[PDB]
Write an enzyme that holds these catalytic residues in place. Structure first.
Site, PDB file in Angstrom:
ATOM      1  N   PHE A 243       5.477 -16.620 -18.076  1.00 55.64           N
ATOM      2  CA  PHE A 243       3.679 -16.085 -17.284  1.00 55.64           C
ATOM      3  C   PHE A 243       3.735 -16.575 -15.945  1.00 55.64           C
ATOM      4  O   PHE A 243       2.013 -16.354 -15.277  1.00 55.64           O
ATOM      5  CB  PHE A 243       2.730 -18.230 -17.458  1.00 55.64           C
ATOM      6  CG  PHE A 243       2.033 -18.537 -17.548  1.00 55.64           C
ATOM      7  CD1 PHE A 243       0.808 -17.457 -18.230  1.00 55.64           C
ATOM      8  CD2 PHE A 243       1.048 -19.010 -16.403  1.00 55.64           C
ATOM      9  CE1 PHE A 243      -0.932 -17.907 -17.824  1.00 55.64           C
ATOM     10  CE2 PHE A 243      -0.119 -19.325 -15.825  1.00 55.64           C
ATOM     11  CZ  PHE A 243      -0.910 -18.574 -16.672  1.00 55.64           C
TER      12      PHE A 243
ATOM     13  N   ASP B 236       1.460 -20.973  -8.506  1.00 54.27           N
ATOM     14  CA  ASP B 236       2.008 -20.115  -9.191  1.00 54.27           C
ATOM     15  C   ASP B 236       3.060 -18.998  -9.106  1.00 54.27           C
ATOM     16  O   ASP B 236       2.387 -17.686  -9.681  1.00 54.27           O
ATOM     17  CB  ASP B 236       1.110 -20.000  -9.941  1.00 54.27           C
ATOM     18  CG  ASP B 236       1.700 -19.230 -11.892  1.00 54.27           C
ATOM     19  OD1 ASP B 236       2.615 -19.546 -12.271  1.00 54.27           O
ATOM     20  OD2 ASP B 236       0.601 -19.004 -12.108  1.00 54.27           O
TER      21      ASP B 236
ATOM     22  N   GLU C 127      -1.225 -25.467  -1.778  1.00 56.13           N
ATOM     23  CA  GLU C 127      -1.351 -26.203  -3.124  1.00 56.13           C
ATOM     24  C   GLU C 127      -0.844 -26.723  -3.506  1.00 56.13           C
ATOM     25  O   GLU C 127       0.479 -27.158  -3.750  1.00 56.13           O
ATOM     26  CB  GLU C 127      -1.117 -24.019  -3.429  1.00 56.13           C
ATOM     27  CG  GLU C 127      -1.791 -24.720  -5.671  1.00 56.13           C
ATOM     28  CD  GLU C 127      -1.236 -23.340  -6.225  1.00 56.13           C
ATOM     29  OE1 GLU C 127      -1.174 -21.718  -5.670  1.00 56.13           O
ATOM     30  OE2 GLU C 127      -1.210 -22.926  -7.383  1.00 56.13           O
TER      31      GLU C 127
ATOM     32  N   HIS D  27      -0.926 -17.028  -2.429  1.00 54.91           N
ATOM     33  CA  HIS D  27      -2.297 -17.912  -1.549  1.00 54.91           C
ATOM     34  C   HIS D  27      -1.859 -18.244  -0.082  1.00 54.91           C
ATOM     35  O   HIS D  27      -1.429 -19.213  -0.583  1.00 54.91           O
ATOM     36  CB  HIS D  27      -2.501 -19.178  -2.776  1.00 54.91           C
ATOM     37  CG  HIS D  27      -2.777 -19.054  -4.000  1.00 54.91           C
ATOM     38  ND1 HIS D  27      -4.226 -17.945  -3.849  1.00 54.91           N
ATOM     39  CD2 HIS D  27      -1.863 -18.791  -5.381  1.00 54.91           C
ATOM     40  CE1 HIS D  27      -4.272 -18.074  -5.898  1.00 54.91           C
ATOM     41  NE2 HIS D  27      -3.194 -18.362  -6.274  1.00 54.91           N
TER      42      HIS D  27
ATOM     43  N   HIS E 172      -7.580 -11.926 -16.791  1.00 58.12           N
ATOM     44  CA  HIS E 172      -6.256 -12.364 -16.890  1.00 58.12           C
ATOM     45  C   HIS E 172      -5.971 -11.254 -16.970  1.00 58.12           C
ATOM     46  O   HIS E 172      -5.732 -10.964 -18.438  1.00 58.12           O
ATOM     47  CB  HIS E 172      -5.402 -13.918 -16.724  1.00 58.12           C
ATOM     48  CG  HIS E 172      -4.527 -14.281 -16.667  1.00 58.12           C
ATOM     49  ND1 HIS E 172      -3.160 -14.441 -17.258  1.00 58.12           N
ATOM     50  CD2 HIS E 172      -4.372 -14.896 -15.320  1.00 58.12           C
ATOM     51  CE1 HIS E 172      -2.262 -14.620 -16.967  1.00 58.12           C
ATOM     52  NE2 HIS E 172      -2.928 -15.394 -15.471  1.00 58.12           N
TER      53      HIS E 172
ATOM     54  N   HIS F 267      -1.196 -28.497  -6.987  1.00 58.25           N
ATOM     55  CA  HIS F 267      -1.935 -28.227  -8.122  1.00 58.25           C
ATOM     56  C   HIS F 267      -1.079 -28.551  -8.849  1.00 58.25           C
ATOM     57  O   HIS F 267      -1.702 -29.763  -9.867  1.00 58.25           O
ATOM     58  CB  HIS F 267      -0.951 -26.707  -8.754  1.00 58.25           C
ATOM     59  CG  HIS F 267      -1.793 -26.187  -9.911  1.00 58.25           C
ATOM     60  ND1 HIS F 267      -2.598 -25.273 -10.185  1.00 58.25           N
ATOM     61  CD2 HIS F 267      -2.330 -26.708 -10.692  1.00 58.25           C
ATOM     62  CE1 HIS F 267      -3.199 -24.896 -11.418  1.00 58.25           C
ATOM     63  NE2 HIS F 267      -3.692 -26.176 -11.897  1.00 58.25           N
TER      64      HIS F 267
ATOM     65  N   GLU G 267     -10.876 -15.435  -8.865  1.00 60.13           N
ATOM     66  CA  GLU G 267      -9.776 -15.117 -10.288  1.00 60.13           C
ATOM     67  C   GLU G 267     -10.665 -15.257 -11.735  1.00 60.13           C
ATOM     68  O   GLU G 267     -11.358 -15.189 -11.546  1.00 60.13           O
ATOM     69  CB  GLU G 267      -8.895 -16.080 -10.059  1.00 60.13           C
ATOM     70  CG  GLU G 267      -7.468 -16.109  -9.279  1.00 60.13           C
ATOM     71  CD  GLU G 267      -6.762 -17.224  -9.268  1.00 60.13           C
ATOM     72  OE1 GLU G 267      -6.011 -17.519 -10.286  1.00 60.13           O
ATOM     73  OE2 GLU G 267      -6.194 -18.327  -8.002  1.00 60.13           O
TER      74      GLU G 267
ATOM     75  N   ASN H 287       1.576 -10.972 -14.825  1.00 60.02           N
ATOM     76  CA  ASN H 287       0.378 -11.788 -14.801  1.00 60.02           C
ATOM     77  C   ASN H 287      -0.950 -10.070 -14.788  1.00 60.02           C
ATOM     78  O   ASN H 287      -1.923  -9.831 -13.920  1.00 60.02           O
ATOM     79  CB  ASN H 287      -0.581 -12.535 -14.486  1.00 60.02           C
ATOM     80  CG  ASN H 287       0.093 -13.562 -15.326  1.00 60.02           C
ATOM     81  OD1 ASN H 287       0.317 -14.983 -13.555  1.00 60.02           O
ATOM     82  ND2 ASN H 287       0.350 -14.005 -15.590  1.00 60.02           N
TER      83      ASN H 287
ATOM     84  N   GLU I  77      -5.919 -24.079  -5.532  1.00 63.90           N
ATOM     85  CA  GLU I  77      -5.375 -25.366  -6.366  1.00 63.90           C
ATOM     86  C   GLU I  77      -4.971 -26.441  -5.962  1.00 63.90           C
ATOM     87  O   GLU I  77      -4.134 -26.802  -6.143  1.00 63.90           O
ATOM     88  CB  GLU I  77      -4.917 -24.342  -7.634  1.00 63.90           C
ATOM     89  CG  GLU I  77      -5.089 -23.495  -8.564  1.00 63.90           C
ATOM     90  CD  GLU I  77      -4.663 -23.362  -9.372  1.00 63.90           C
ATOM     91  OE1 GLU I  77      -3.312 -22.441  -8.997  1.00 63.90           O
ATOM     92  OE2 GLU I  77      -5.033 -22.971 -10.017  1.00 63.90           O
TER      93      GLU I  77
ATOM     94  N   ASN J  18      11.449 -24.172 -16.855  1.00 68.05           N
ATOM     95  CA  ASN J  18      10.927 -23.080 -16.352  1.00 68.05           C
ATOM     96  C   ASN J  18       9.253 -22.921 -17.372  1.00 68.05           C
ATOM     97  O   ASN J  18       8.843 -23.855 -18.234  1.00 68.05           O
ATOM     98  CB  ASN J  18      11.227 -21.640 -16.474  1.00 68.05           C
ATOM     99  CG  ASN J  18      11.646 -21.419 -17.354  1.00 68.05           C
ATOM    100  OD1 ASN J  18      10.954 -20.659 -18.699  1.00 68.05           O
ATOM    101  ND2 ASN J  18      12.317 -22.369 -18.583  1.00 68.05           N
TER     102      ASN J  18
ATOM    103  N   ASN K 128       4.883 -22.546 -13.194  1.00 67.12           N
ATOM    104  CA  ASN K 128       3.044 -23.297 -12.705  1.00 67.12           C
ATOM    105  C   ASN K 128       2.983 -23.852 -12.033  1.00 67.12           C
ATOM    106  O   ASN K 128       2.989 -24.070 -10.656  1.00 67.12           O
ATOM    107  CB  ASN K 128       2.718 -22.700 -14.046  1.00 67.12           C
ATOM    108  CG  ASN K 128       1.092 -22.389 -13.574  1.00 67.12           C
ATOM    109  OD1 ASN K 128       1.049 -22.184 -12.811  1.00 67.12           O
ATOM    110  ND2 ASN K 128       0.781 -22.325 -15.016  1.00 67.12           N
TER     111      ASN K 128
ATOM    112  N   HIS L 277       0.407 -11.063  -4.756  1.00 71.10           N
ATOM    113  CA  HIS L 277       0.943 -11.742  -4.830  1.00 71.10           C
ATOM    114  C   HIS L 277       2.415 -10.996  -3.324  1.00 71.10           C
ATOM    115  O   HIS L 277       2.211  -9.752  -3.709  1.00 71.10           O
ATOM    116  CB  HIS L 277       1.862 -12.472  -5.823  1.00 71.10           C
ATOM    117  CG  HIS L 277       1.090 -13.855  -5.532  1.00 71.10           C
ATOM    118  ND1 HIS L 277       1.862 -14.917  -4.891  1.00 71.10           N
ATOM    119  CD2 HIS L 277       0.992 -14.465  -6.948  1.00 71.10           C
ATOM    120  CE1 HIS L 277       1.786 -15.768  -5.076  1.00 71.10           C
ATOM    121  NE2 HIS L 277       1.029 -15.828  -6.651  1.00 71.10           N
TER     122      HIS L 277
HETATM  123  O1  LIG Z   1      -5.786 -20.267 -11.857  1.00 69.39           O
HETATM  124  C1  LIG Z   1      -4.579 -19.687 -11.541  1.00 69.39           C
HETATM  125  O2  LIG Z   1      -4.759 -19.209 -12.728  1.00 69.39           O
HETATM  126  C2  LIG Z   1      -3.061 -18.045 -12.247  1.00 69.39           C
HETATM  127  C3  LIG Z   1      -2.944 -17.729 -13.881  1.00 69.39           C
HETATM  128  O3  LIG Z   1      -1.652 -16.982 -13.747  1.00 69.39           O
HETATM  129  C4  LIG Z   1      -2.610 -18.300 -11.633  1.00 69.39           C
HETATM  130  O4  LIG Z   1      -1.428 -19.400 -11.830  1.00 69.39           O
HETATM  131  C5  LIG Z   1      -3.243 -18.828 -10.427  1.00 69.39           C
HETATM  132  O5  LIG Z   1      -2.505 -18.622  -8.816  1.00 69.39           O
HETATM  133  C6  LIG Z   1      -4.025 -20.285 -10.526  1.00 69.39           C
HETATM  134  O6  LIG Z   1      -5.215 -20.239  -9.164  1.00 69.39           O
HETATM  135 MG   LIG Z   2      -1.837 -23.141  -9.331  1.00 63.76          MG
HETATM  136 NA    NA Z   3       0.404 -16.949 -13.616  1.00 58.75          NA
END
Ligand SMILES: O=C1O[C@H](CO)[C@H](O)[C@H](O)[C@H]1O
Ligand SMILES: [Mg+2]
Ligand code: NA
Ligand SMILES: [Mg+2]
Ligand SMILES: [Mg+2]
Ligand code: NA
Ligand code: NA
Ligand code: NA
Ligand code: NA
Ligand code: NA
Lengths: 1011, 211, 170
Positions: A589, A189, A404, A379, A528, A406, A525, A592, A449, A585, A90, A345
């Site tokens: 996660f 992610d 990204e 993304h 979730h 992150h 976003e 989603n 991110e 890993n 992630n 995605h």
């Molecule tokens: O903030 C986020 O939350 C999601 C969690 O599944 C995922 O990681 C997205 O890419 C990210 O932008």
């Molecule tokens: Mg991310």
């Molecule tokens: Na995720």
């Protein structure tokens, strides 16, 4: 030179980005958008060899095919072929963070292809090769001669091969590196894969060509007039005889046309662009484009000589729409949008990150069928076909740059570094240069991110400069920085603030009115959908509809990123993080989505479809007020179907034509309903049906629905008199009650109903006991990184409090013989380390009719974490085929996710009462149930329940659904109360207070009998 | 960007400095061919960003300049914003594309006259008094270049100063320029003489226009 | 790789830009702005050789001094020494306008200098070389090994020489 470890070199000899080209040599073909002989595809069987590092690739490979190589299909991700393992991480980068360096052991995929080139292509014009997607960097060679280099895995890289090709057979050699400095900007992610995952094609352009063209549409105040401006750029021999003709078509009718020679207007002291021309076409009462009605025109750009000779033609679909932000509102063709979106995605359970038309079409049809009107390219720029499809089917798109970072610390370490500005600008500029003509794209996104750096501000301005027709947004650094026109937070809650230092996520309602704030708010976003989730979803939509400036958001996300693996028997099963030896890993996660990897819906999809309905209803007496939330279209393919039923029994029904103008209303008075005979609750159910099929739905499609409780007549009639009287039989060990063929047995040591006999057969495999826990949902586990164990997570609190280990201690168990029944009174106390967590007091009254009334009263210590549930459970000995019930359904629904469900009489096969979440957890619950029927059994009252072949214990101890095994008999969980599931995010407590079982004292009663 | 010591001297003797990025593409056609091309954004950004990173602590530097005669390109707008974000302490100016574009905080024309307009297409040089009040305009006006002192020149210099003094928003300008760019050469007798364009066999050249 | 004909490569191995540094190892010296023994000037007499194009430069030049080279003062513009003619043009570019290409005949100035550093500089720390101004681009070598490349004639170009230095003459 190790260009893959230099953020200063993102390409070598790469051609300039531009909109989709086909180089038609016949205008009619360009108009109809039929295939182009000048555009060939090189997809198919290629040769491939894997190597641990580039220094391992033998020099011979450049000139001759490697014997060790295998024949594989392209596009493809080589991890999907088993050459190496796909990694799911992630936030934490898959490589050591030491920019711009990557591991010396850098997986290298050597692709090669032998192909033919017609001499006609080399006798004139330019021949280039196009790689739509290569992960993550590569070097190209043609017939042994080095051609170029490229980075950025989500945008096409083009190279001129005119001077490398020979008539006949030619051989390409592509060395793809898994890791490169480009990876530092690709920490999204998702699964980390590599290879040539998108189309590879050969395009032929004339020496004098159209090198670029932009299409814009401006309107007057009421959109009754428009001006289409087309700026066209050319390369090659510039002459006075050259001309450009842009004609606009509506079907086979040419509505507009303009011709002109090259030589733009004067722009500065040095003159103007002699290699450019801008055509302006007037269009009266244009048909406007929107997701509601995707009206499109066809624009054909012809490069030709004044005297009539066509050199080449290009073209695109034109959608007449205006996107602007005014007075704080995002407007489409002058109307405020309500974004019903979702993040998507590019994922396929079998092919990885390779997209295909069928998968794209399926997704769009499913999205529109479930009332979504927008999608965010999370993304990175998508496969070129995606935009065409969104243009034609009608979906608002947020095109996002492939950036990204992150995993950096802080998140903006590279985005605030000017030395990374070059690599970043290419990811933004080349995207815009490629997708600026698609009407579906209404908003540009600077990435995801990557904190907030000066580079973001620079690029934000660059876009505002080159394309003032689309708003620019970016969530990083606080969601409301100077780099975004839209307040676009992720997982900001409706009413609750999350005052994080520096980057707080305010309650969305409160965010809009912060001093000085005026921008509209659309979550990039939210909600979730990890596993059993989307609780509280209805709360967002109520706010979106009440607050003008709250204009929606994109659910996270569309589809589970699960991959298919096979067992010893060759049977497929869904895998996630770590299932390929990949480590570190982040396990599950990566899943989603609202739908499974194979696109089978998750229960939450129906909740989304319901809350996102385009018709709102209100009831007043016999009148149903229908309001349209459509902004442009009329309800010309909708009819209202209504039905009144008494406790599942149909009394009346009918249908009425829906004729409501966008944003309008329509009143429908229902006929004089006949007062029912039986006692019970009358329920009104209305649904909007689309009589005719459309390009995105079949005839009969249901787009909306709503229920209302009508009159209720409480039953005041006492049941018939009982014939017999239950007999009690006592022993030190048990209390056995008999009434005819029915028998009940209560263990005096445990204080629980340990057995029942209907006729000559026993009914229980496990005693009926209290249950205050549930197999933890992903939202209960609350982790986004398999390394962080939040002690504040619900599961951690229940575990530490002893809820999963507390043992029942018997306090009382007595029996009493009454005039017409036997009464069993019991009391238990669950404790953990001398701490009394719960106390359950019950009475079981078995009368002469054969019914058992179970009254349960529970006390929960105020200082123990609120329990997941308050009910009973047991393992029935039998297994039936159907489950019948009067309550909310038909699909799985929980307290904070049940608005979509309808009260009625449902009947489903046992299997449908179990939701196959890849990571097993409490599931299949149905609420507001007044009656449950299973086999010979019937339970009545007002409870929530789930029924299946899997115990909460097995669900809790199993990591994958394919590892579950049906247990003997059927496990039944009947709850008087159940905790909400939450889902505002899945890495912190997210269940709203009103859905937490904090009352301290609970009461519920069930009647068990035979059917 | 100048030799590092120049800023120290200006800090100490006291002179307001306009630090300008090493970017001029005057010979292009049109003038912004490169500056509006995203492919040249990287090269341009280093000339701006590295200048700022080097001289941002000098008190003498009061204004950042994006360069000279390179038309007006999207690269200018991008870099303008970069500076505003990184160093909000100093105004950013740039004359290219009309002297009053979106890339300058100051109306900074070159050779705009006091009372007489020069309505050139696209890039007009309005009379400076008139420029100040064009509908919507509110920025200050300081000429980046004016009163070309070539040879026997500076005629009409007083007209500018009378204007600078009467109009609050006309805040002066920078004369063009300080020193003749003539080079020394020696005749057969070893005697030195001032040379200019073309005196070194250089061709094409622009003769005395360097003085 | 003809890096001087690629606007995508404006430098190679160049250190990040920063404000004037002296690396004073004594606070009072820094306050008073007195000299710093950690900052050395390399201005003075260097070895120079002119060539019509980079291709004409003999590989031998990377290893040892060129006999035909002259001793000249640095800083300086080689036009002022008479190696070639300075050109005065206003607007029109001094070369054919064909970006990112330049003439094949490209006057090349080969500078070189033998020097050495304090023993302690070979022991610890980072030793960098700073060129406040080179017109208009250049490749750098140290003890025969390629170090880096840089453009923009009006800002300093710095390179870490730490891993190239050696005892004695460099
Ligand atoms: O903030 C986020 O939350 C999601 C969690 O599944 C995922 O990681 C997205 O890419 C990210 O932008
Ligand atoms: Mg991310
Ligand atoms: Na995720
Ligand atoms: Mg690189
Ligand atoms: Mg270069
Ligand atoms: Na709203
Ligand atoms: Na209708
Ligand atoms: Na589990
Ligand atoms: Na004044
Ligand atoms: Na001059």
């Amino acid at each position: 030179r190790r260009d893959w470890e230099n953020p200063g070199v993102t390409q070598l000899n790469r051609l300039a980005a531009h909109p989709p080209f086909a180089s038609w040599r016949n205008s009619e073909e360009a108009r109809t958008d039929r295939p182009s002989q000048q555009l060939r595809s090189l997809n198919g069987e290629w040769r491939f060899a894997w190597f641990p590092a580039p220094e391992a690739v033998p020099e011979s490979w450049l000139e001759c095919d490697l014997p060790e190589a295998d024949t594989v299909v392209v596009p493809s991700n080589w991890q999907m072929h088993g050459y190496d393992a796909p990694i799911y991480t992630n936030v934490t980068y898959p490589i050591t963070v030491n920019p711009p360096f990557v591991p010396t052991e850098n997986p290298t995929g050597c692709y090669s292809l032998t192909f033919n080139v017609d001499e006609s292509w080399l006798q004139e014009g330019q021949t280039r090769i196009i790689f739509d997607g290569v992960n993550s960097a590569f070097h190209l060679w043609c017939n042994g001669r080095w051609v170029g280099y490229g980075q950025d895995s989500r945008l096409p890289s083009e190279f001129d091969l005119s001077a490398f090709l020979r008539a006949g057979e030619n051989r390409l050699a592509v060395m793809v590196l898994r890791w490169s400095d480009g990876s530092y900007l690709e920490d999204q992610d998702m699964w980390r894969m590599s290879g040539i995952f998108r189309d590879v094609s050969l395009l032929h352009k004339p020496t004098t060509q159209i090198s670029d063209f932009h299409v814009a549409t401006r309107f007057n105040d009421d959109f009754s007039r428009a001006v289409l401006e087309a700026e066209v750029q050319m390369c090659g021999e510039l002459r006075d005889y050259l001309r450009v003709t842009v004609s606009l078509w509506q079907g086979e009718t040419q509505v507009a046309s303009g011709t002109a020679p090259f030589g733009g207007e004067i722009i500065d002291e040095r003159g103007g662009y002699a290699d450019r021309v801008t055509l302006r076409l007037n269009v009266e009462n244009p048909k406007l484009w929107s997701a509601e009605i995707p009206n499109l025109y066809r624009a054909v750009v012809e490069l030709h000589t004044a005297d009539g000779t066509l050199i080449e033609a290009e073209a695109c679909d034109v959608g007449f729409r205006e996107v602007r932000i005014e007075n704080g509102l995002l407007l489409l063709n002058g109307k405020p949008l309500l974004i019903r979106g979702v993040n998507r995605h590019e994922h396929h359970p079998l092919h990885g990150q390779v997209m295909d038309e069928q998968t794209m079409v399926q997704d769009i049809l499913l999205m529109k069928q479930n009332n979504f009107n927008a999608v965010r390219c999370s993304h990175y720029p998508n496969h070129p076909l995606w935009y065409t499809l969104c243009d034609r089917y009608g979906l608002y798109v947020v095109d996002e740059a492939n950036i990204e970072t992150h995993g950096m610390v802080p998140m903006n370490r590279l985005t605030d570094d000017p030395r990374w500005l070059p690599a970043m600008s290419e990811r933004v500029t080349r995207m815009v240069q490629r997708d600026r003509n698609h009407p579906s794209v209404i908003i540009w996104s600077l990435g995801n991110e990557s904190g907030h750096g000066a580079n973001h501000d620079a690029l934000y301005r660059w876009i505002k400069s080159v394309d003032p027709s689309r708003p620019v947004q970016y969530e990083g650094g606080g969601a409301d920085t100077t780099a975004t026109d839209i307040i676009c937070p992720m997982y900001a809650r409706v009413d609750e603030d999350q005052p994080f230092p520096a980057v707080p996520k305010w309650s969305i309602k409160k965010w809009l009115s912060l001093p000085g704030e005026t921008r509209p708010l659309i979550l990039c976003e939210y909600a979730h959908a990890m596993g059993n989730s989307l609780g509280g979803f209805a709360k967002y939509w109520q706010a979106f509809r009440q607050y003008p400036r709250l204009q929606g958001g994109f659910v996270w996300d569309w589809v589970d990123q699960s991959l298919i693996k096979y067992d010893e028997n060759g049977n497929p099963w869904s895998a996630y993080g770590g299932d390929f030896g990949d480590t570190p890993n982040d396990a599950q996660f990566c899943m989603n989505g609202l739908v499974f990897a194979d696109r089978t819906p998750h229960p939450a999809l129906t909740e989304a479809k319901h809350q996102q309905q385009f018709f709102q209803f209100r009831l007043s007496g016999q009148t149903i007020e229908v309001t349209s939330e459509y902004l442009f279209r009329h309800s010309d393919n909708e009819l209202l179907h209504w039905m009144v039923a008494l406790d599942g029994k149909p009394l009346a029904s009918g249908e009425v034509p829906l004729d409501v103008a966008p944003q309008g209303k329509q009143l429908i008075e229902l006929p004089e309903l006949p007062q029912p005979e039986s006692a019970g609750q009358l329920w009104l159910t209305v649904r909007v049906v689309q009589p005719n099929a459309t390009a995105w739905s079949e005839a009969g499609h249901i787009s909306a629905w709503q229920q209302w409780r009508l009159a209720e007549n409480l039953s005041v009639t006492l049941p018939a008199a009982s014939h017999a009287i239950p007999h009690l039989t006592t022993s030190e060990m048990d209390f056995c009650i008999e009434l005819g063929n029915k028998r009940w047995q209560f263990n005096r040591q445990s204080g629980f109903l340990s057995q029942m006999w209907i006729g000559d057969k026993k009914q229980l495999l496990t005693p009926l006991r209290d249950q205050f826990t549930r197999a933890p949902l992903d939202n209960d586990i609350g982790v986004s990184e398999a390394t962080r164990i939040d002690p504040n997570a619900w599961v951690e609190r229940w575990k530490a409090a002893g809820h999963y280990q507390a043992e029942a201690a018997l306090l009382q168990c007595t029996a009493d013989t009454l005039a017409d029944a036997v009464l069993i009174t019991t009391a238990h106390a669950w404790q953990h380390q001398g701490k009394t967590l719960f106390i359950s007091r019950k009475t079981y009254r078995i009368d002469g009719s054969g019914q058992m009334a179970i009254t349960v009263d529970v006390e929960v210590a105020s200082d123990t974490p609120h329990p997941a549930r308050i009910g009973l459970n047991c393992q029935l000995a039998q297994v039936a085929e159907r489950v019948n019930w009067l309550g909310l359904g038909p699909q799985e629904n929980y307290p904070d996710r049940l608005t979509a469900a309808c009260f009625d009489r449902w009947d489903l096969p046992l299997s449908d009462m179990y939701t196959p979440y890849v990571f097993p957890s409490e599931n299949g619950l149905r609420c507001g149930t007044r009656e449950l029927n299973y086999g010979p059994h019937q339970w009545r009252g007002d409870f929530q329940f789930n029924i299946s072949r899997y115990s909460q214990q097995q669900l809790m101890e199993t990591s994958h659904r394919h590892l579950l095994h049906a247990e003997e008999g059927t496990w039944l969980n009947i709850d008087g109360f159940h905790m909400g599931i939450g889902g505002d995010d899945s890495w912190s407590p997210s269940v709203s207070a009103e859905f937490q079982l904090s009352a301290g004292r609970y009461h519920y009663q069930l009647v068990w009998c035979q059917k």
